Amino acid sequence: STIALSEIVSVVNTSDGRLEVFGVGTDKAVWHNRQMAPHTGSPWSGWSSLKGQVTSKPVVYINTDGRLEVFARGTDNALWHIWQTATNAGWSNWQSLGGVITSNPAIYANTDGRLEVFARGADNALWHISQTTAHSGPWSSWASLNGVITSNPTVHINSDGRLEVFARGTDNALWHIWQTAPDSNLWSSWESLNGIITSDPVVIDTADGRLEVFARGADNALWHIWQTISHSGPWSGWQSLNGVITSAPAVAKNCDNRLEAFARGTDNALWHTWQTVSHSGPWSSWQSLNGVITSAPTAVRDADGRLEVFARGTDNALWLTWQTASSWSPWISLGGVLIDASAIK
Amino acid sequence: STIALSEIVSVVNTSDGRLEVFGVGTDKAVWHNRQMAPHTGSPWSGWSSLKGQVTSKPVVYINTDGRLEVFARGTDNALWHIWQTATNAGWSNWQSLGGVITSNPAIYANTDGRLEVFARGADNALWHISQTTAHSGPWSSWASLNGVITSNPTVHINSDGRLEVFARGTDNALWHIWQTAPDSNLWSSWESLNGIITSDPVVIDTADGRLEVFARGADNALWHIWQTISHSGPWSGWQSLNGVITSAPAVAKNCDNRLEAFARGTDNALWHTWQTVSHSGPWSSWQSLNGVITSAPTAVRDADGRLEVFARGTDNALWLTWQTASSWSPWISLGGVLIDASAIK
Ligand SMILES: [Cl-]
Ligand SMILES: [Cl-]
Ligand SMILES: [Cl-]
Ligand SMILES: [Cl-]
Ligand SMILES: [Cl-]
Ligand SMILES: [Cl-]
Ligand SMILES: [Cl-]
Ligand SMILES: [Cl-]
Ligand SMILES: [Cl-]
Ligand SMILES: [Cl-]
Ligand SMILES: [Cl-]
Ligand SMILES: [Cl-]
Ligand SMILES: [Cl-]
Ligand SMILES: [Cl-]
Ligand SMILES: [Cl-]
Ligand SMILES: [Cl-]
Ligand code: NA
Ligand code: NA
Ligand code: NA
Ligand code: NA
Ligand code: NA
Ligand code: NA
Ligand code: NA
Ligand code: NA
């Protein structure tokens, strides 16, 4: 019935190589901030309001034509969205995709360019809806993929083009379900990956085409589990990455594909652990990046191939640190006053 | 009526992070070779025949479901192809897509997952054909995009999803034509980018979403030209990268997005020049990677984020060198006996 403290912004590296960050202000509007230039340490726009009135984390996704699109639950509990009219232009108005949802939305593009959105319903099953044509409306009707879930869902694509969704179940195990063909409405049954998880799951694709899922465990360590064959079962056992974490974990890939995980520690600093040597190499010990943070961190690789990490500060502004040749940069403030609007806490 | 010596293999980093290389043997069959493991320096399969009888460079492309597909002109001058039945499985038979073509095929996926293939016709115009549905046959009818071209064409996608094709014209200038909308059959007119080029052009997308085109000039230097705005004109002037090159250039992106160009030099060694500092930084002087090569080089970034470069040797085998922390590795031989099967020489 609870999860580790959430990430509170959605961030992407856009089609022109600039990071762009989306969050929620105290009066429930979505705000965004973007780099002026496609480089680590670029000046930022500052926060600009996309208006709306949201009751979930707003989640941005890039259409296959490069246009950003933000999805969020509205005050009426419908799924709403707003999109760029062109990659380097302004935004539509907020429009409703209806339904009644009870989680943050999770988004992925099918191999045919149609976005598909997954969200928990009032019945605690996973529901979904999709664009009927590539990178465009109109959208399909809502339908259910069943299950009973207790965390925000997350979706990824397999290296063979099949979407796969992960969520915590009523028993606190990690569950998943997958497309049996790309672009299709043919799905598997829900299957348990076992474990006991106390955060939303995070999923990423490895350099070698396997899904790998991360989540906080019952012992507050970071745990992970992965496909042992490219786009295929069986899965590994759950394996611990140790640490003691007090937020959801965030994961990104370095530019050499080494995975790196980030989370708040018991001292409220940002901590991280990373694969060493290569993308098949052993994980480092947890090490501190300092800061005093009041959310999970959010990690992304920028256009210079460096990881940048965003986290809310004690002042409720969004702060930022990034990799340097030697080390990491000191935390800098991007201002704003942000809230955790997660539909599941 | 001629072009600089061509690249003689087609290489990709596949859905499971392994490099895979395609070439042509002395009896006109297509052969391929792949890394066992997703890492720099992996053992290789060795050469395996995909049979066929080709009269162009064979060009591999990855469908949006991860399956490889190889395109080549047949002995009957039709476009032929062969594809993986699944990403980690075997291949179909060679099948004909008809037409009569007079260049190597150039391939890209539209944002809706449909591959589109461009090839010069008997009239020296650019013709095209596409999959009617994402990552699958059947294919459309052939049609023409007009123009009069004197090099192999190359296609890329803009950061807004619009395909764009580049080719040398009768006047030896660089010409181009583009989709006016993603996934569409609406194209612009051919427009000249001027210059005088003496190789096939090479095109790549920058980290900041601009197309940048490279080609040998009339003075045998490497020249380049780029979109000055993301997915948009106007283009820059032609600018020289200096050097004296005796093959077509090859270009790839380092894992921090710095572009790096490769070509054979006057001493028949492999030479290279790269952006320094960042993807917006100045280009280095040309420096040697040694070797004695009998083709243009072919460059690709591997699953460890390192560039690997392939080139035919004096013995007609394919040789290989890659980036190390300090330097580059000594050339090693992958064997085989390869030919330049380019439909335009
Ligand atoms: Cl607000
Ligand atoms: Cl609005
Ligand atoms: Cl509906
Ligand atoms: Cl995730
Ligand atoms: Cl540790
Ligand atoms: Cl990038
Ligand atoms: Cl600091
Ligand atoms: Cl809050
Ligand atoms: Cl042969
Ligand atoms: Cl065959
Ligand atoms: Cl036809
Ligand atoms: Cl190219
Ligand atoms: Cl020089
Ligand atoms: Cl890779
Ligand atoms: Cl050597
Ligand atoms: Cl030859
Ligand atoms: Na942008
Ligand atoms: Na980008
Ligand atoms: Na996801
Ligand atoms: Na999340
Ligand atoms: Na492969
Ligand atoms: Na790959
Ligand atoms: Na191309
Ligand atoms: Na080429």
XYZ file of C-alpha atoms and ligand atoms in Angstrom:
714
model
C 0.000 0.000 0.000
C 3.017 2.429 -0.186
C 6.124 2.872 -2.365
C 9.529 4.508 -1.897
C 9.575 8.262 -2.545
C 9.111 8.892 -6.290
C 11.012 10.672 -8.986
C 9.224 13.982 -9.408
C 10.239 15.110 -12.856
C 10.111 13.402 -16.251
C 13.189 14.152 -18.388
C 14.244 13.409 -21.963
C 17.111 14.049 -24.311
C 15.185 15.610 -27.222
C 15.548 15.363 -31.018
C 17.907 18.375 -31.064
C 20.080 17.049 -28.200
C 18.763 19.277 -25.410
C 17.523 17.963 -22.081
C 13.975 18.924 -21.214
C 12.438 18.423 -17.791
C 8.754 18.287 -16.750
C 7.362 18.712 -13.253
C 4.312 19.842 -11.272
C 3.958 23.080 -9.306
C 1.975 23.673 -6.107
C -1.223 24.631 -8.019
C -1.129 21.386 -10.099
C 0.017 22.861 -13.453
C 2.751 21.145 -15.470
C 5.941 23.169 -15.853
C 8.901 22.557 -18.081
C 12.482 23.656 -18.412
C 14.957 23.073 -21.204
C 18.609 23.474 -22.082
C 19.399 26.241 -24.550
C 22.306 24.280 -26.040
C 23.021 20.572 -26.622
C 25.828 20.303 -24.037
C 26.544 19.449 -20.430
C 26.244 22.648 -18.419
C 24.102 24.577 -20.940
C 22.081 27.484 -19.635
C 18.446 26.604 -18.978
C 15.241 28.272 -20.128
C 13.793 28.466 -16.657
C 10.377 27.110 -15.778
C 7.475 27.785 -18.168
C 3.906 26.656 -17.464
C 2.060 24.256 -19.766
C -0.978 24.872 -17.527
C -3.292 21.857 -17.049
C -4.403 20.519 -13.693
C -2.808 17.166 -12.972
C -3.190 14.479 -10.351
C -0.331 12.222 -11.510
C 3.318 12.569 -12.353
C 3.407 14.110 -15.850
C 5.316 11.815 -18.195
C 6.905 13.008 -21.399
C 7.558 10.741 -24.352
C 9.083 11.432 -27.758
C 6.979 10.433 -30.774
C 8.817 8.707 -33.630
C 8.605 12.026 -35.574
C 10.539 13.776 -32.744
C 7.559 15.637 -31.225
C 7.241 15.609 -27.415
C 3.993 14.529 -25.859
C 3.124 14.765 -22.148
C 0.625 12.455 -20.473
C -0.975 12.961 -17.067
C -4.084 12.112 -15.090
C -6.455 15.087 -14.818
C -8.574 16.190 -11.877
C -11.476 14.225 -13.411
C -9.264 11.053 -13.318
C -9.169 10.833 -17.117
C -5.911 10.445 -19.008
C -5.045 13.806 -20.528
C -2.303 14.813 -22.937
C -0.610 17.713 -24.661
C 1.867 17.627 -27.556
C 4.195 19.706 -29.618
C 2.777 20.785 -32.983
C 6.361 20.465 -34.338
C 9.665 19.453 -32.651
C 10.888 23.087 -32.475
C 7.505 24.744 -31.889
C 4.715 25.222 -29.374
C 2.183 22.984 -27.779
C -1.393 21.935 -28.389
C -3.991 22.475 -25.693
C -4.554 19.792 -23.075
C -7.002 17.211 -24.485
C -8.705 14.315 -22.734
C -8.307 10.660 -23.715
C -11.057 9.752 -21.227
C -10.947 6.641 -19.087
C -10.638 6.530 -15.295
C -7.120 5.848 -14.092
C -5.418 5.331 -10.728
C -1.686 5.397 -11.579
C 0.793 7.516 -13.451
C 0.639 6.758 -17.201
C 3.410 4.660 -18.768
C 4.214 5.171 -22.444
C 6.099 3.483 -25.278
C 6.117 3.617 -29.064
C 5.322 0.411 -30.881
C 7.656 -0.480 -33.775
C 4.995 0.964 -36.145
C 5.276 4.420 -34.510
C 1.993 4.233 -32.566
C 2.293 5.317 -28.940
C 0.609 3.044 -26.426
C -0.250 4.173 -22.922
C -0.682 1.931 -19.891
C -2.359 2.938 -16.664
C -3.977 1.305 -13.683
C -7.769 1.493 -13.534
C -10.303 1.820 -10.701
C -10.342 -2.005 -10.601
C -6.533 -2.031 -10.065
C -6.047 -3.858 -13.369
C -3.742 -2.518 -16.056
C -5.571 -0.734 -18.883
C -4.210 0.532 -22.186
C -5.010 2.768 -25.123
C -3.062 3.552 -28.339
C -2.712 5.904 -31.273
C -4.488 4.399 -34.304
C -1.833 5.692 -36.710
C 1.897 6.529 -36.294
C 2.628 9.574 -34.071
C -0.927 10.861 -34.294
C -4.479 10.725 -33.104
C -7.118 9.593 -33.100
C -6.712 7.057 -30.323
C -8.226 3.590 -29.856
C -10.792 2.681 -27.222
C -9.564 1.799 -23.756
C -9.285 -1.907 -22.888
C -7.873 -3.978 -20.006
C -4.877 -6.283 -19.716
C -6.182 -7.480 -16.307
C -3.823 -8.138 -13.390
C -3.985 -6.553 -9.949
C -1.282 -3.964 -9.397
C -0.007 -1.936 -6.451
C 2.647 0.286 -8.020
C 2.902 2.544 -10.994
C 3.465 0.410 -14.086
C 6.464 0.777 -16.384
C 6.661 -0.268 -20.032
C 9.625 -1.030 -22.241
C 10.273 -2.584 -25.624
C 12.148 -5.814 -26.144
C 14.980 -6.021 -28.661
C 12.526 -7.875 -30.990
C 9.957 -5.037 -30.834
C 7.513 -6.511 -28.304
C 6.276 -4.211 -25.556
C 6.453 -5.486 -21.987
C 4.920 -3.993 -18.851
C 6.117 -4.398 -15.238
C 4.261 -3.677 -12.008
C 4.136 -4.691 -8.366
C 1.337 -7.144 -7.535
C -0.911 -7.490 -4.449
C 1.640 -9.901 -2.936
C 4.406 -7.252 -3.458
C 6.143 -9.423 -6.049
C 7.193 -8.021 -9.416
C 4.780 -9.034 -12.188
C 4.958 -8.641 -15.952
C 3.052 -9.115 -19.163
C 4.185 -8.842 -22.806
C 3.062 -8.503 -26.410
C 3.427 -11.799 -28.241
C 4.076 -9.854 -31.488
C 5.191 -6.266 -32.228
C 2.410 -3.702 -32.754
C -0.236 -6.211 -31.736
C -3.160 -6.519 -29.328
C -2.014 -10.100 -28.513
C -0.611 -10.257 -24.991
C 0.672 -12.980 -22.718
C -0.766 -13.796 -19.319
C 0.575 -11.963 -16.303
C 3.487 -13.881 -14.758
C 5.258 -13.324 -11.468
C 8.944 -12.618 -11.227
C 8.661 -13.098 -7.430
C 10.688 -10.936 -5.000
C 9.322 -8.411 -2.524
C 9.561 -4.829 -3.772
C 9.027 -1.566 -1.917
C 9.377 0.910 -4.793
C 8.010 1.334 -8.261
C 10.072 -0.801 -10.642
C 12.465 0.734 -13.185
C 13.216 -1.083 -16.469
C 15.949 -0.511 -19.049
C 17.364 -2.291 -22.084
C 20.976 -3.450 -21.883
C 23.467 -3.053 -24.751
C 22.941 -6.759 -25.449
C 19.171 -6.523 -25.867
C 17.884 -7.807 -22.510
C 15.365 -6.102 -20.228
C 16.763 -5.500 -16.717
C 14.492 -4.343 -13.907
C 15.497 -2.511 -10.724
C 13.557 -1.966 -7.500
C 14.039 -1.388 -3.807
C 13.662 -4.553 -1.790
C 12.069 -5.413 1.534
C 15.503 -4.887 3.153
C 15.783 -1.395 1.502
C 18.665 -2.561 -0.658
C 18.547 -2.015 -4.408
C 17.752 -5.270 -6.211
C 17.680 -6.232 -9.877
C 16.620 -9.038 -12.194
C 17.017 -9.533 -15.964
C 16.188 -11.554 -19.046
C 19.018 -14.148 -19.442
C 18.600 -14.392 -23.216
C 18.037 -11.481 -25.626
C 14.273 -10.569 -25.594
C 13.513 -13.825 -23.764
C 13.103 -15.803 -20.591
C 14.120 -17.382 -18.421
C 14.832 -14.491 -16.039
C 17.769 -14.409 -13.644
C 17.157 -14.751 -9.935
C 16.713 -11.473 -8.056
C 20.203 -10.222 -7.159
C 21.103 -7.559 -4.629
C 23.082 -4.436 -5.428
C 23.236 -3.674 -1.667
C 22.948 -0.058 -0.408
C 20.312 1.342 1.929
C 17.983 3.590 -0.017
C 15.187 5.905 1.030
C 13.737 6.720 -2.415
C 12.931 4.947 -5.636
C 16.032 4.145 -7.706
C 16.743 5.726 -11.085
C 18.833 4.080 -13.764
C 20.582 5.289 -16.909
C 23.238 4.075 -19.354
C 26.619 5.719 -19.653
C 27.706 6.339 -23.228
C 29.737 3.066 -23.189
C 26.472 1.316 -22.066
C 27.583 0.727 -18.450
C 24.452 0.915 -16.312
C 24.429 3.323 -13.363
C 21.858 3.410 -10.560
C 20.987 6.410 -8.359
C 18.944 6.716 -5.163
C 18.612 8.755 -2.012
C 20.532 7.335 0.950
C 19.845 7.217 4.698
C 21.742 10.538 5.057
C 19.400 12.124 2.390
C 22.354 12.525 0.001
C 22.321 11.238 -3.555
C 24.146 7.925 -3.826
C 25.110 5.851 -6.885
C 26.541 2.502 -7.998
C 27.666 1.636 -11.537
C 28.923 -1.198 -13.666
C 32.721 -1.095 -13.927
C 34.913 -1.882 -16.945
C 32.071 -2.613 -19.393
C 28.340 -3.208 -19.711
C 28.912 -6.854 -18.555
C 31.200 -5.829 -15.659
C 30.743 -5.963 -11.875
C 28.956 -3.213 -9.959
C 30.875 -0.680 -7.873
C 30.248 -0.004 -4.195
C 27.723 2.726 -3.461
C 29.369 6.163 -3.360
C 27.995 9.575 -2.459
C 27.242 12.557 -4.706
C 26.254 14.689 -1.694
C 23.233 17.025 -1.804
C 20.228 17.059 0.488
C 17.321 15.763 -1.535
C 13.578 15.477 -1.043
C 12.701 13.194 -3.970
C 14.131 10.261 -5.832
C 16.785 11.340 -8.363
C 16.099 11.423 -12.116
C 19.018 10.463 -14.391
C 19.559 11.001 -18.126
C 22.435 10.909 -20.570
C 22.930 14.252 -22.310
C 24.175 15.076 -25.825
C 27.808 15.037 -24.653
C 27.313 11.436 -23.404
C 27.419 12.545 -19.769
C 24.901 11.607 -17.080
C 23.009 14.467 -15.484
C 20.927 13.937 -12.342
C 18.019 16.043 -11.113
C 16.493 15.931 -7.628
C 14.280 18.091 -5.480
C 16.082 20.026 -2.739
C 15.076 20.959 0.798
C 13.856 24.306 -0.640
C 11.609 22.419 -3.124
C 13.528 23.662 -6.130
C 14.995 21.279 -8.656
C 18.745 20.833 -8.295
C 21.200 19.396 -10.802
C 24.621 17.645 -10.812
C 26.465 16.003 -13.754
C 29.519 13.901 -14.589
C 32.837 15.626 -15.276
C 36.119 14.118 -16.455
C 37.359 13.838 -12.866
C 34.255 13.611 -10.698
C 30.778 15.183 -10.621
C 29.844 18.845 -10.615
C 28.617 20.654 -7.513
C 24.852 20.777 -7.226
C 23.299 23.816 -8.915
C 19.725 25.078 -8.588
C 17.266 25.340 -11.441
C 14.716 27.007 -9.121
C 10.993 26.298 -9.283
C 8.808 24.935 -6.522
C 7.899 21.359 -7.325
C 5.575 18.775 -5.773
C 5.298 15.006 -5.879
C 2.084 14.551 -7.816
C 2.414 10.742 -8.157
C -0.991 9.072 -8.416
C 0.434 6.234 -6.255
C 2.478 7.020 -3.103
C 31.662 9.165 -64.483
C 33.828 7.714 -61.612
C 33.885 7.868 -57.796
C 36.548 7.377 -55.120
C 37.145 3.744 -54.140
C 34.105 2.453 -52.210
C 33.493 0.916 -48.846
C 33.161 -2.794 -49.521
C 31.290 -4.083 -46.516
C 28.031 -3.015 -44.876
C 28.194 -3.153 -41.060
C 25.702 -2.682 -38.229
C 25.553 -2.809 -34.474
C 22.663 -5.278 -34.057
C 19.771 -5.509 -31.571
C 21.865 -7.680 -29.218
C 24.917 -5.369 -29.376
C 27.076 -7.438 -31.731
C 28.678 -6.056 -34.873
C 27.750 -7.861 -38.057
C 29.503 -7.318 -41.368
C 28.324 -8.101 -44.928
C 30.481 -8.381 -48.028
C 30.752 -10.035 -51.448
C 33.063 -12.904 -52.401
C 34.716 -13.560 -55.771
C 31.767 -15.677 -57.042
C 29.226 -12.894 -56.229
C 27.600 -14.459 -53.124
C 26.961 -12.348 -50.022
C 28.946 -13.396 -46.959
C 28.580 -12.294 -43.388
C 30.548 -12.347 -40.184
C 29.483 -11.498 -36.661
C 30.852 -10.951 -33.183
C 30.114 -13.709 -30.688
C 29.915 -11.237 -27.796
C 28.761 -7.611 -27.441
C 32.236 -6.158 -26.772
C 35.237 -4.602 -28.455
C 37.600 -7.412 -29.398
C 35.011 -10.233 -29.327
C 35.810 -13.372 -31.265
C 34.136 -13.493 -34.671
C 31.993 -16.169 -36.290
C 34.034 -16.251 -39.455
C 32.515 -15.826 -42.888
C 29.263 -17.662 -43.686
C 27.589 -17.523 -47.105
C 24.079 -16.133 -47.576
C 24.414 -17.259 -51.215
C 22.686 -15.006 -53.786
C 24.371 -13.560 -56.845
C 24.825 -9.820 -56.505
C 25.926 -6.997 -58.754
C 25.879 -4.210 -56.138
C 27.259 -3.609 -52.692
C 24.974 -5.564 -50.332
C 23.466 -3.193 -47.779
C 22.115 -4.342 -44.451
C 19.462 -2.452 -42.534
C 17.770 -3.174 -39.215
C 13.962 -3.291 -39.260
C 12.175 -1.555 -36.378
C 11.478 -5.045 -34.904
C 15.265 -5.716 -34.772
C 15.419 -8.110 -37.754
C 18.268 -7.605 -40.254
C 17.457 -7.291 -43.911
C 20.009 -7.210 -46.751
C 19.337 -5.498 -50.068
C 21.334 -5.929 -53.269
C 20.999 -5.729 -57.030
C 20.810 -9.187 -58.627
C 22.334 -10.402 -61.876
C 18.996 -9.614 -63.573
C 19.334 -5.962 -62.346
C 16.303 -6.295 -60.067
C 16.428 -5.269 -56.424
C 16.656 -8.424 -54.338
C 16.498 -8.943 -50.591
C 16.872 -11.453 -47.796
C 15.870 -11.089 -44.138
C 16.077 -12.690 -40.763
C 12.959 -14.625 -39.746
C 13.704 -13.488 -36.150
C 16.515 -11.323 -34.670
C 18.359 -14.378 -33.257
C 17.499 -16.836 -36.042
C 18.145 -17.718 -39.666
C 17.412 -16.096 -42.952
C 14.713 -16.230 -45.591
C 15.625 -17.088 -49.161
C 16.627 -14.323 -51.552
C 13.453 -12.802 -53.052
C 13.096 -10.295 -55.871
C 11.472 -6.871 -55.525
C 11.717 -6.435 -59.310
C 12.576 -3.142 -60.949
C 15.720 -2.379 -62.952
C 18.358 -0.535 -60.967
C 21.789 0.950 -61.673
C 23.125 1.839 -58.198
C 23.576 0.273 -54.808
C 20.295 0.384 -52.837
C 19.922 2.934 -50.027
C 17.579 2.132 -47.149
C 15.846 3.849 -44.236
C 12.887 3.160 -41.974
C 10.092 5.689 -42.016
C 8.781 6.773 -38.591
C 5.895 4.282 -39.094
C 8.344 1.341 -39.315
C 8.081 0.860 -43.096
C 11.435 0.465 -44.829
C 11.875 2.503 -47.988
C 14.527 1.712 -50.563
C 16.055 4.161 -53.027
C 18.015 3.208 -56.108
C 19.046 4.730 -59.392
C 17.194 3.477 -62.464
C 18.186 2.859 -66.096
C 17.137 6.479 -66.758
C 19.590 7.687 -64.052
C 16.696 9.059 -61.995
C 16.180 8.056 -58.382
C 13.474 5.417 -57.903
C 11.943 4.119 -54.688
C 9.830 1.333 -53.260
C 8.542 0.673 -49.702
C 7.079 -1.888 -47.344
C 3.287 -1.434 -47.197
C 3.169 -2.249 -43.477
C 5.732 -1.898 -40.634
C 8.771 -4.232 -40.905
C 7.067 -6.511 -43.405
C 6.076 -7.232 -46.948
C 4.342 -6.925 -49.216
C 6.031 -3.993 -50.908
C 4.590 -1.084 -52.905
C 5.050 -0.572 -56.630
C 8.203 1.136 -57.827
C 7.970 4.851 -58.672
C 10.414 7.650 -59.557
C 11.577 10.739 -57.693
C 13.241 12.004 -60.916
C 16.628 13.746 -60.858
C 19.734 12.716 -62.774
C 22.366 11.134 -60.564
C 25.974 10.027 -60.982
C 26.787 8.459 -57.616
C 25.214 5.953 -55.325
C 22.441 7.669 -53.377
C 22.324 7.846 -49.587
C 19.229 8.344 -47.440
C 18.835 9.591 -43.899
C 16.045 10.741 -41.626
C 15.698 14.260 -40.314
C 15.151 14.898 -36.614
C 11.454 15.591 -37.471
C 11.028 12.188 -39.178
C 11.305 13.253 -42.830
C 13.494 11.133 -45.085
C 16.054 12.924 -47.236
C 18.158 11.539 -50.077
C 21.551 12.810 -51.312
C 23.334 12.075 -54.581
C 25.868 13.543 -56.976
C 24.323 15.177 -60.055
C 25.474 15.316 -63.710
C 27.341 18.561 -62.935
C 29.170 16.778 -60.034
C 27.411 18.945 -57.454
C 25.702 17.419 -54.428
C 21.919 17.263 -54.865
C 19.137 16.379 -52.449
C 15.431 15.794 -52.144
C 13.221 15.318 -49.059
C 9.857 14.132 -47.779
C 7.643 17.080 -46.905
C 5.973 14.942 -44.187
C 7.019 11.762 -42.328
C 5.858 8.454 -43.843
C 4.527 10.213 -46.921
C 4.790 10.019 -50.707
C 5.013 13.858 -50.813
C 8.515 14.941 -51.795
C 10.218 18.226 -52.521
C 11.914 19.091 -55.787
C 15.556 18.198 -56.222
C 17.784 21.086 -55.106
C 21.504 21.564 -55.552
C 23.869 22.001 -52.660
C 26.595 22.942 -55.192
C 30.233 21.848 -54.688
C 32.202 19.437 -56.852
C 32.374 15.933 -55.391
C 34.507 12.971 -56.417
C 33.126 10.301 -54.076
C 29.763 8.985 -53.057
C 28.355 11.242 -50.337
C 28.057 10.102 -46.709
C 25.323 11.546 -44.452
C 24.899 11.409 -40.676
C 22.729 13.047 -38.033
C 24.482 15.217 -35.456
C 23.649 15.133 -31.729
C 21.741 18.381 -32.291
C 19.464 17.004 -35.005
C 21.071 18.348 -38.196
C 22.032 16.349 -41.285
C 25.742 16.710 -42.150
C 27.097 15.381 -45.435
C 30.693 14.417 -46.236
C 32.376 13.824 -49.593
C 35.733 13.970 -51.297
C 36.219 17.155 -53.258
C 37.760 18.006 -56.609
C 41.032 18.745 -54.755
C 40.880 15.277 -53.037
C 40.366 16.890 -49.651
C 37.482 15.778 -47.456
C 34.684 18.355 -47.515
C 31.455 18.693 -45.557
C 28.235 20.692 -45.456
C 25.309 20.710 -42.996
C 21.833 21.919 -42.144
C 22.280 25.131 -40.051
C 18.987 24.675 -38.198
C 17.615 21.399 -36.790
C 15.894 19.452 -39.663
C 16.000 22.585 -41.832
C 17.729 24.812 -44.322
C 19.539 26.924 -45.027
C 22.648 24.753 -45.431
C 26.144 25.885 -44.495
C 28.664 26.587 -47.216
C 30.868 23.642 -48.183
C 33.806 23.603 -45.752
C 37.068 21.725 -46.127
C 38.394 19.226 -43.616
C 41.684 19.113 -45.593
C 43.576 15.800 -46.021
C 44.430 14.064 -49.281
C 42.291 10.973 -49.649
C 42.300 8.133 -52.139
C 39.024 6.426 -51.141
C 35.522 7.386 -50.151
C 35.302 8.731 -46.589
C 33.454 6.936 -43.799
C 31.966 8.695 -40.808
C 30.752 7.587 -37.387
C 29.877 9.137 -34.019
C 31.920 8.517 -30.911
C 29.840 7.709 -27.850
C 30.009 11.397 -26.750
C 28.651 12.275 -30.267
C 31.946 13.695 -31.601
C 32.028 12.932 -35.319
C 35.055 11.091 -36.712
C 35.934 10.685 -40.392
C 38.085 7.926 -41.930
C 39.621 7.525 -45.387
C 42.538 5.973 -47.201
C 45.505 8.315 -47.631
C 48.081 8.790 -50.401
C 50.340 6.253 -48.608
C 47.430 3.676 -48.661
C 47.226 3.793 -44.848
C 44.011 4.467 -42.974
C 43.811 8.087 -41.861
C 41.296 9.869 -39.606
C 40.207 13.282 -38.315
C 37.745 13.896 -35.469
C 35.905 16.620 -33.642
C 37.756 17.583 -30.456
C 36.302 18.509 -27.055
C 32.627 18.010 -27.981
C 30.210 17.446 -30.848
C 30.379 21.231 -31.620
C 34.198 21.358 -31.354
C 36.921 21.920 -33.964
C 38.285 19.091 -36.099
C 41.700 17.564 -35.423
C 44.482 17.294 -37.985
C 44.506 14.092 -40.014
C 46.461 11.335 -38.251
C 47.430 7.847 -39.361
C 46.106 4.472 -38.190
C 48.588 2.622 -40.428
C 47.564 -0.477 -42.413
C 47.789 -1.035 -46.144
C 44.254 -0.954 -47.457
C 42.564 -1.694 -50.763
C 39.110 -0.227 -50.079
C 37.545 2.680 -48.286
C 37.265 2.049 -44.526
C 33.941 1.209 -42.849
C 33.415 2.621 -39.335
C 30.892 1.708 -36.627
C 30.459 2.261 -32.917
C 30.309 -1.017 -30.998
C 28.420 -1.963 -27.817
C 31.280 -0.698 -25.627
C 30.966 2.751 -27.295
C 34.231 2.277 -29.184
C 34.751 2.839 -32.908
C 35.836 -0.174 -34.921
C 37.067 0.196 -38.504
C 37.100 -2.453 -41.223
C 39.021 -2.266 -44.503
C 40.171 -4.627 -47.201
C 43.870 -5.524 -47.093
C 46.413 -6.167 -49.835
C 45.588 -9.900 -49.455
C 41.868 -9.138 -50.062
C 40.865 -10.209 -46.581
C 38.952 -7.910 -44.286
C 41.112 -6.349 -41.586
C 40.016 -4.656 -38.375
C 41.328 -2.012 -35.915
C 39.501 -0.366 -32.964
C 39.860 2.379 -30.361
C 41.586 1.605 -27.063
C 41.965 3.804 -23.987
C 45.398 4.966 -25.157
C 45.396 4.607 -28.933
C 44.055 2.127 -31.505
C 44.622 -1.605 -31.702
C 46.954 -3.205 -34.231
C 45.207 -4.368 -37.373
C 43.915 -7.944 -37.156
C 42.631 -10.123 -39.999
C 39.127 -11.509 -40.234
C 40.091 -13.476 -43.376
C 37.769 -13.907 -46.344
C 38.402 -12.837 -49.910
C 36.243 -9.840 -50.695
C 35.487 -7.837 -53.841
C 34.164 -4.370 -54.565
C 30.778 -5.159 -56.046
C 29.580 -1.514 -56.153
C 27.073 -0.960 -58.956
C 28.728 2.460 -59.522
C 32.552 2.781 -59.635
Cl 1.380 25.180 -10.461
Cl -4.695 23.924 -22.377
Cl -12.606 4.633 -24.876
Cl 11.399 2.806 -15.945
Cl 28.311 -0.753 -1.175
Cl 22.509 12.242 -27.613
Cl 27.621 20.259 -3.972
Cl 5.117 17.201 -2.430
Cl 31.376 -15.808 -53.455
Cl 18.302 -18.165 -51.455
Cl 6.509 -2.591 -59.160
Cl 25.895 7.421 -45.621
Cl 45.630 17.894 -41.413
Cl 25.291 -0.032 -28.513
Cl 49.121 -2.589 -37.167
Cl 37.442 -5.980 -56.410
Na 14.598 20.323 -27.810
Na 18.495 13.237 -28.500
Na 9.319 2.987 -19.447
Na 8.840 5.840 -12.634
Na 23.247 -9.992 -33.470
Na 22.730 -2.268 -31.030
Na 22.054 6.124 -45.185
Na 28.037 4.309 -49.148
